[PDB]
Design a protein that fits this description.
Blueprint lengths: L2 E2 L2 E2 L6 E9 L4 E7 L4 E8 L5 H16 L10 E3 L10 E6 L3 E2 H7 L4 H20 L2 E2 L8 E3 L5 E3 L6 E2 L22 H5 L7 H16 L11 H10 L4 H5 L4 H9 L8 H4 L5 H10 L10 H5 L29 H11 L8
Antiparallel strand pairs: 1-2, 3-4, 4-5, 5-7, 6-7, 8-10, 9-12, 10-11
Helix pairs in contact: 1-12, 3-5, 5-10
Length: 346
């Protein structure tokens, strides 16, 4: 078995000429030559079976990405694993090779307004499809936006995704949350489990702000500091927006804070297109019910050079699954069955 940087990386006769790329969540990432399609590809080795949470996230992502087919969402080209459940200790996921991601790009490159506009269009185009399948991504951030040299953008990493469930979104104040802190909507800290589509729109607004300035707009250092950063820019919520929070602990926390006035977007982003800042304002609205939806965002004047609903496809049917009551042993069987289509004999 060919090996790379210490570990085994056995991707069979189809994929050759490995090159180390880095470390992912559950293992190592390499590029390799696809001897069948004659292009280099990305291969992630995934070793998740020793932890329930890793198995849940792995199964979630495989099921979603195999069902989705969209230009702005990363596909799964192939899955490599042992022929029997007893022998399966890892799974390898083959995907299109993408040069970089928006996180690495923003660390070093200024983006022209034309690039910001095109990147935002592609993000929202992909998100329209995701939301049309009743799926929430729930961890949108620059490192989950892959890019190639010609600035094609693909959304990746669906390990925290869920089916939308707005009727069961409510929770208590300061309820713990898994997704990345800097891109969390204010309501996560107040009264929301993150089961509504508005959670993703907030994250996209954070990404737009970061494309405009090359720095995160709300870089909270810990759980509740995140809300301090948000209110530091948006200002104190209005009486109407407060009255939408029935949660007494959350409401009374907000009432306890000194009054803060909104910081105008054009003072935070003095070089930004004014249409970009109008859309940013609508994404980063405190009240999630008033927040712009993905299809409205696509129709915003900032994106008028690209907007084309007939070329912004939706999924052919909603998604449906629970993975929280299944032990890691049964999750392994489900991953085995979900990956069977890629075995030779199929």
């Amino acid at each position: 078995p060919e090996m790379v940087r210490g570990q085994v990386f056995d991707v069979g006769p189809r994929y050759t000429n490995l090159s180390y790329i880095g470390e992912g969540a559950y293992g190592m990432v390499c590029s390799a030559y696809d001897n069948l399609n004659k292009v280099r590809v990305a291969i992630k080795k995934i070793s998740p079976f020793e932890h329930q949470t890793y198995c849940q996230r792995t199964l979630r992502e495989i099921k979603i990405l195999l069902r989705f087919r969209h230009e702005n969402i990363i596909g799964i080209n192939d899955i490599i694993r042992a022929p029997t459940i007893e022998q399966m200790k890892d799974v390898y996921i083959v995907q299109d090779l993408m040069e970089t991601d928006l996180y690495k790009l923003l660390k070093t490159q200024h983006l022209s307004n034309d690039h910001i506009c095109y990147f935002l269009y592609q993000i929202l185009r992909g998100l329209k499809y995701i939301h049309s399948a009743n799926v929430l991504h729930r961890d949108l951030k620059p490192s989950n936006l892959l890019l190639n040299t010609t600035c094609d953008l693909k959304i990746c990493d669906f390990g925290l995704a869920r089916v939308a469930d707005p009727d069961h979104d409510h929770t208590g104040f300061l309820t713990e949350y898994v997704a990345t802190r800097w891109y969390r909507a204010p309501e996560i800290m107040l009264n929301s489990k993150g089961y509504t589509k508005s959670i993703d729109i907030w994250s996209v607004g954070c990404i737009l702000a970061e494309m405009l300035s090359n720095r995160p707009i709300f870089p909270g250092k810990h759980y509740l500091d995140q809300l301090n950063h948000i209110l530091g820019i948006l200002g104190s919520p209005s009486q109407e927006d407060l009255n939408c929070i029935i949660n007494l602990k959350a409401r009374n926390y907000l009432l306890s804070l000194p009054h803060k006035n909104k910081v105008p977007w054009n003072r935070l982003f003095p070089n930004a297109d004014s249409k970009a800042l109008d859309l940013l304002d609508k994404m980063l609205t405190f009240n999630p019910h008033k927040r712009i939806e993905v299809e409205q965002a696509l129709a915003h004047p900032y994106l008028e050079q690209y907007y084309d609903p007939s070329n912004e496809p939706i999924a052919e049917a909603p998604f449906k699954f629970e993975l929280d009551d299944l032990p890691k042993e049964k999750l392994k069987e489900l991953i085995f069955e979900e990956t069977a289509r890629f075995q030779p004999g199929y």
